[PDB]
Structure 1
Amino acid sequence: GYEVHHQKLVFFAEDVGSNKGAIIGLMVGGVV
């Protein structure tokens, strides 16, 4: 079998200084 290593994923959301309705449309489909 193939050996594998550990992984790490961190998600943090907080908006400093509200106002301005910004708009971001970004797509990054990884590659196999």
Structure 2
Amino acid sequence: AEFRHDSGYEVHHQKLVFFAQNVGSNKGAIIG
């Protein structure tokens, strides 16, 4: 399996976030 993405764009304006993980942008491994 492979996941190929090119030239992504992102804008983030999160408000009032609690108990979150990687809130915003995530591109790496995250384990709960």
Q: TM-score range by the shorter chain?
A: under 0.3
Greater strand fraction, Structure 1 or Structure 2: 2
Which protein shows a greater Rg? Answer: 1
Higher relative contact order (CA 8 A, sep 6+): 2
Q: How high is the TM-score relative to the length of structure 1? A: 0.27
| TM-score normalised by L of structure 2 | 0.27
